Amino acid sequence: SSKYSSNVQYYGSLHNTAHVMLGRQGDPHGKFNLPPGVMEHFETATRDPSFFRLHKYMDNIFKKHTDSFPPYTHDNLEFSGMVVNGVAIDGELITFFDEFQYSLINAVDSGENIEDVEINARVHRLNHNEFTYKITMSNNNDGERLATFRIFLCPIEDNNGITLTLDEARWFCIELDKFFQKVPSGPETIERSSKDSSVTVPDMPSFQSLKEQADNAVNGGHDLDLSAYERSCGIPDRMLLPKSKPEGMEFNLYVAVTDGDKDTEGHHAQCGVHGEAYPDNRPLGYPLERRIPDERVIDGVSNIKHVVVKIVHHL
């Protein structure tokens, strides 16, 4: 419930109340006067497990609506002319555990004339290895068409072992990349990087380090062009792929390529932080956002292809 609500006096605010409501579960009449809790804050909610129990519930309130549409037609997904020939991963899907260090200084009080001792915290975070997409593919059209390269990584079996369905699994898939490129009039072979993903963001510069740097261009004339960081909406590059098992799991990779001219049929525009119209017009999760009752179909549009990949975890 944000202010674009049409009736806030009636529909209230499920989500946000649901954050305060899960937080004082520690003290609802407030007999102890404990402070607010991990869920009543954004830099800390993902910590508490009910955080994801609470968004699973918001999550299928949306799917309820999401699913009421009629499924898509053949004629629906087809971007006639284009066809994915093949999909390949140039490298290895390997994820491991790196090490990071951020600084504990603003945390301890130092008053004055007392001097600063550099204290640091070291954490353990996930990582993967750069890899490249080699998407081989022919534009049968007469000539050069704009393209939306959409890439989802959906799962395959259950954890019961079961092996779900692109209906059972269409919803579970996470987006790995979305980009716009022009396609030549004939068999190109587009290759693209772990590193250029559109949903990702690099780790950011240190506090200090941006002090060092700020300072140096003050006594020096002028610049700071580190535009690299004035928005950064995405998730951590480290989190690009999932962790998986050390034995390895085979995920399913979906590259569906839709038609750029109608997509951007009108217009960063990634983090539209300042008013900037989001550029893709397809709805979001396209085209996996709709019930897909007979796979029979996703399967026979030339511009959708799925290939299996396999990720491995280094201990």
Binding site: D158, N160, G161, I162
Partner: protein
């Protein structure tokens, strides 16, 4: 017989006896015996002067014994008593002439399970059954060991007289449970041992039957600790966690549907999952267990088991664990 022994005789006799068991025998000697014999005319074959025979007749007479083609559990205090009367005749035979006679005479008018059950225990414990190997339960009475589907497939084979082997399944919705560690419980081998183990050392044995089984007591302690470990390991290998101990005050969290059927009897009932234990009429009260479990648990805790007189019999010593098993199973 050879108006006796052999073993490829004793043996033959047995195979004839447990052949098509849900139907009157087809081996003619088994039948004139079946007809002609009188377990009561030469009490001499009998080391009891035939008090055992004389007791079964009495019941077969007032026809107060369980009917044929009906089911049977060894947990029924009467069915058991009837099955075990057959064991006491077959038991006091001086030779094959008395065994074949009786398991022929009886086979033909006592129920099948009492019968299957008596013939086996008797063969296992009685003096007279050395040479023999018993056929595997799984093939003599397949309904206790094969599925419900294969059973129906076999019924059709038969209706139509076209043969063949069917491949059996595994229980629930594999990839949905812990019918993932099924291969273990459902094996015809373990099921065989489980039954044998308790035919070798039965809970009902009295030392009047002839000898004393030695440490059934620890032997009970141990055999089950083994299946419980052996089981706990298989659940390790399946990403499953060691098993919950059951309590009477809690829900039976994990229920199953067995999909198995009796031959005469109906399908095995099923159990719904997250159920509350009910007091079962006829058997015993749920609390009846809860107190039993405390009387138990106080003998362990005290250091002594107390008998009927109020004698305290000490158990903090090596025979310990066997007097505990005699009170616990």
């Amino acid at each position: 017989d050879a108006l006796g022994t052999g073993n490829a005789q004793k043996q033959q006799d047995i195979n004839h006896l447990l052949d098509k068991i849900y139907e009157p025998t087809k081996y003619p000697d088994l039948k004139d015996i079946a007809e002609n014999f009188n377990p009561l005319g030469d009490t001499s074959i009998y080391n009891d002067h035939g008090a055992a025979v004389e007791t079964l007749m009495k019941e077969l007479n007032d026809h107060r014994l369980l009917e044929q083609r009906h089911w049977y559990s060894l947990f029924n205090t009467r069915q058991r008593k009837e099955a075990l009367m057959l064991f006491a005749v077959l038991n006091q035979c001086k030779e094959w002439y008395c065994f074949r006679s009786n398991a022929a005479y009886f086979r033909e008018r006592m129920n099948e399970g009492e019968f299957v059950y008596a013939l086996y225990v008797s063969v296992i414990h009685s003096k007279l059954g050395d040479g023999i190997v018993l056929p595997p339960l799984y093939q003599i009475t397949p309904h206790m060991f094969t599925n419900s589907e294969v059973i129906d497939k076999a019924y059709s084979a038969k209706m139509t007289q076209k043969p063949g082997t069917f491949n059996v399944s595994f229980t629930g919705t594999k990839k949905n449970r812990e019918q993932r560690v099924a291969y273990f419980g459902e094996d015809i081998g373990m099921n065989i041992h489980h039954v044998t183990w308790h035919m070798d050392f039965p809970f009902w044995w009295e030392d009047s039957y002839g000898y004393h089984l030695d440490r059934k007591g620890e032997l009970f302690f141990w055999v089950h600790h083994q299946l419980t470990a052996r089981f706990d390991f298989e659940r390790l290998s399946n990403w499953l966690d060691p098993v919950d101990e059951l309590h009477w005050d809690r829900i039976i969290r994990e229920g199953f549907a067995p999909l198995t059927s009796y031959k005469y009897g109906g399908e095995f009932p099923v159990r719904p999952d997250n159920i509350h234990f009910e007091d079962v009429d006829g058997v015993a009260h749920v609390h009846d267990l809860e107190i039993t479990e405390s009387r138990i648990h106080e003998a362990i805790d005290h250091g002594y088991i107390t008998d009927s007189d109020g004698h305290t019999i000490d158990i903090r010593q090596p025979k310990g664990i066997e007097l505990l098993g005699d009170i616990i199973e």
